[PDB]
Write a protein that binds this ligand. Structure first.
Ligand SMILES: CCCC[C@H](NC(=O)[C@H](C)NC(=O)[C@H](CCC(=O)O)NC(=O)[C@H](Cc1ccccc1)NC[C@H](CC(C)C)NC(=O)[C@@H](NC(=O)[C@@H](N)CCCNC(N)=[NH2+])C(C)C)C(N)=O
Lengths: 99, 99
């Protein structure tokens, strides 16, 4: 849909069968969720932003539904202060901000 | 001017008289520019992100130009790894997420 920004762009997502709330983040390359149990083998990685770098577990080929829109890709799980859907997944669902 | 999210949504902005490039970040409640000498009375602030907090100076009622669009607002200046336009300014240019 068309989402304005007077409020944070939070939507609901379903991963690993459970619901969770996440922020549509245009400033992130990747998708990162707070620590949870996800089926599948994972690989340790480091990612950074403001503040610095944090360790996370990278899960490849995760099926995720973001506002009823399916994507299947890389999700990173670790201690992010907020769950964010980055461009890696936003691209999959056809998100554009525009002009 | 809206955050064309796919490849890093970077655009030209004008602040304090200098031409700059910034990342349009839904998910950035704030705008934070690279260290620079802006005249104007400030307030010391601490903003948090991915891996922690960063000390920045807060300037209010700052006039900036985002992809040829005029906006006025609170700009924070500090040791940021990239210039970030946050929702506080994105809303004034009418930027929206579309999928
Ligand atoms: C595919 C490559 C992956 C490998 C990895 N890549 C990265 O780490 C890439 C560059 N990082 C990013 O893209 C990260 C997000 C993590 C990620 O995407 O993986 N982006 C980010 O962290 C971007 C800013 C940024 C962009 C580019 C470079 C640096 C920084 N900010 C995202 C973030 C979202 C929010 C939900 C936490 N927003 C902010 O950090 C803004 N903060 C705010 O708006 C605060 N008011 C939010 C509350 C914080 N406080 C609290 N909870 N008590 C700030 C910019 C004013 C690497 N190691 O190089």
């Amino acid at each position: 849909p068309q989402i304005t920004l007077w409020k944070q762009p939070l939507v609901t997502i379903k991963i690993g069968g459970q619901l969770k709330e996440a922020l549509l983040d245009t400033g992130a390359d990747d998708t990162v969720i707070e620590e949870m149990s996800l089926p599948g083998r994972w690989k340790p990685k480091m990612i950074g932003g403001i503040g610095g770098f944090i360790k996370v577990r990278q899960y490849d080929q995760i099926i995720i539904e973001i506002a009823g829109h399916k994507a299947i890709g890389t999700v990173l799980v670790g201690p992010t202060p907020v769950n964010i859907i980055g461009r890696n997944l936003l691209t999959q669902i056809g998100a554009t901000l525009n002009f």
